[PDB]
Amino acid sequence: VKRTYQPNKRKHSKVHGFRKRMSTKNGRKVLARRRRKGRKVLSA
Amino acid sequence: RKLGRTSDQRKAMLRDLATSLIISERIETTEARAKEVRSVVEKLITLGKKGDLASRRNAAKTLRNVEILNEDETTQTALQKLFGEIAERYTERQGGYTRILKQGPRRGDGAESVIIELV
Amino acid sequence: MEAKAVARTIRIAPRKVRLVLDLIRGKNAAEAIAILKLTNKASSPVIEKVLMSALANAEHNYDMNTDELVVKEAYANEGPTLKRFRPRAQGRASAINKRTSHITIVVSDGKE
Amino acid sequence: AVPKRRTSKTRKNKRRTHFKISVPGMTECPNCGREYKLSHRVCKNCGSYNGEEVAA
RNA sequence: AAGAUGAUGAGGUUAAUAGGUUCGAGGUGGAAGCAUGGUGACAUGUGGAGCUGACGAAUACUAAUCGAUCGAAGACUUAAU
RNA sequence: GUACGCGAGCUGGGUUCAGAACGUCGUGAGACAGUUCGGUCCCUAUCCGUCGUGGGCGUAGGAAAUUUGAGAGGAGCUGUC
RNA sequence: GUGAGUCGCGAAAGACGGGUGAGAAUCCCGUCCACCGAUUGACUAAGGUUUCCAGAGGAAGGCUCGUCCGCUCUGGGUUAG
RNA sequence: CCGAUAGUGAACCAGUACCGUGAGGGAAAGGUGAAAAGCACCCCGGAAGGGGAGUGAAAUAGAACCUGAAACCGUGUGCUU
RNA sequence: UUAAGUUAUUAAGGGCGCACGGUGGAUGCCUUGGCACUAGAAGCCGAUGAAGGACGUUACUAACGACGAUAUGCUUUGGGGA
Ligand SMILES: [Mg+2]
Ligand SMILES: [Mg+2]
């Protein structure tokens, strides 16, 4: 087998990273929930 | 006949134990292996009383190609020692010196241990 | 008179210890030292320490002698239970119990 | 495969009338003044199986 | 000689219980070295040679040491001497 | 006869999964009155039962031997000349 | 708790000696032995993030023990025209 | 109105540890005594732990520290098998 | 001494009861936080750079708070009295 999640940075500091989120409407809303809810981390 | 292990590994284990016991004249072991190496080494002290070339060509098989020894900063080989020294103590006696001492058991494996010697 | 001594949170189950105790209960001290001190197990060191420790405190504090000292009662009781878990097949687990103990010895002479 | 029933506090105990362990052989030393086990060595002082023949 | 373990059995120095040694059976099938004949590979003699787990007698040289535990002092009633 | 005996002892060839195909019925998805190539069989035995085998106590004192045998099991076939 | 001190203890060739220590089949040292060798070797990328090294410690972790570790405690280590 | 399985999910270092690639989902865990006066000192022990001596009204209140039930596990014993 | 008859003693272990502990944490009591509400105010912040966060700052310093290279805080103006 090779299981899912053969990991990497660039595809993870891309897509789920910030500047994608804060370069898109929906993502800005997402961040609004992860702030309103309180969290020690974003983009992860 | 008796089995500690597989065929080969047993044999080499016995060339090893019997290679020792002469380098050191006594060791501490589990009882079973002491019984078997007793039989062997008994046969080798029966051999080293004769002292022919062929006898060396029979002690060669079991004992090892060399294992260096120094008593007095001397060079020996566990073969020179045998036919040159050991039997020359027990000529007046038969072979069949070796004795066993049921020393005690062992915390780890519960195995009985002993002290087999030829002294 | 009376006398005792304790060991706590010892990292052994009760049972394995309890057998060893059933080789003790009733005897005289010297014998029981020997009995423990020979059998090839993991509890024998411990019980040996605790027993002779008890004779120590009896001697220093209470000023007894050693002939008549006998083992009136002895018993080990259950202790905290460090739950762990070993993985196992098919995506599951199984919770091991790393057990403990509280050993209790009460040496006695029987007299005043 | 499995038990169907709960093994009660009696049978769990009657089953354990045989996990006891035997009183090991013992005897005093001939000139080491203490107990040890039979057809074996003392572990003390100088070894005494018939008297000293060892150090350990 | 019985054996999963426990049991059964042979035995425990006032002894042949097992090992070893010395003999022997059987088995394998002509050891090594040496010489000789060979350019050598190899053969012949020394030699039914040497070797040998379990089988068979003898041989106390070694190992079963010194030791502790358990176990009775025989209820009554009749009917007998 | 004993779940047309027995799968917590075995197989798994047909048949009762998914694929595909032939005749057919259906406007059609698909289905047989059928046929055909292939296709995952887990269970570390608690109790009872059964096969063997050891402890404890009893059999009015304690031991070693021998042995009776109420009962139970087993064997029970048959041709040619 | 029961199951159960029962199944399992995650392919594998180790043995001996000498040290240490309160205590060693498992720790250090050596000698022998065995194993791979288009590799169980050597070098880097992705990746993980201090696991690296020294000195101490062994409460739990390590599928056993452990005087040891990739676990803890203290300290310290990564250099580019 | 609740008074720690209730009540904010959250009384305590919680939207934490953790799980998941990610959106996201989501925990358990209060109480020594009046005051820290938090066990000087001896003894066994390698330590841990303990017996003693003392602080305190009480240390079976001694840090996993108010109260401490039931399951569960033991030790001994009157009766019994 | 004989025959016959009867019968208890055993507890390796177990059950009933009685006690003493151990385990683990319910109940009791309390609150270090919260729920729902009344009156009243207030109902925005930001390119003169927010909200929210990263990295740092202490004599020794891991974390929360507090603060921001003038850094575990500066000056002033009042208040307060070791
Ligand atoms: Mg060693
Ligand atoms: Mg409560």
C-beta atoms of B103 and D40 within 8 A: yes
Instruction: Say if residues C3 and C57 touch (Cβ distance below 8 Å).
Output: yes
The answer to whether some atom of strand F lies closer than 7 Å to the beta carbon of D8 is: no
- The residue type found at C64 is M
Nearby residues of C102 by Cβ (< 8 Å), 6 or more positions away: C6, C7, C8, C9, C10, C76, C77, C78, C79
- The residue type found at B89 is R
Nearest nucleotide (CA of C73 to C1'): H75
Q: Name the token pair of C97.
A: 């119990």
The answer to whether some atom of strand I lies closer than 7 Å to the beta carbon of C80 is: yes
Q: How far is residue A1's CA from residue B105's CA, in Å, rounded to a whole number? A: 48
Q: How far is residue C65's CA from residue C76's CA, in Å, rounded to a whole number? A: 26
Q: Which of residues 27-46 of D touch strand E (CB under 7 A)?
A: 27-28, 30, 38-40
C-beta atoms of C22 and D20 within 8 A: yes
3-state percent helix, strand, coil for chain B, nearest multiple of 5: 40, 15, 45
Q: Resolution in angstroms for this experimental structure?
A: 3.8
Closest CA to C68 of C24, C109, C19: C109
Strand, helix or coil for residue B99: strand
3-state percent helix, strand, coil for chain C, nearest multiple of 5: 35, 30, 35
C-beta atoms of B104 and D56 within 8 A: no
CB atoms within 10 A of CB B72: 4
Bridge partners of C7, per DSSP, are C103
Half-sphere exposure of D37 (CA within 13 A, CB side): 18
Domains and CATH numbers, chain C: 1-112 (3.90.470.10)
Q: Exposed, middle or buried: residue C40 (CB in 10 Å: 0-12, 13-18, 19+)?
A: middle
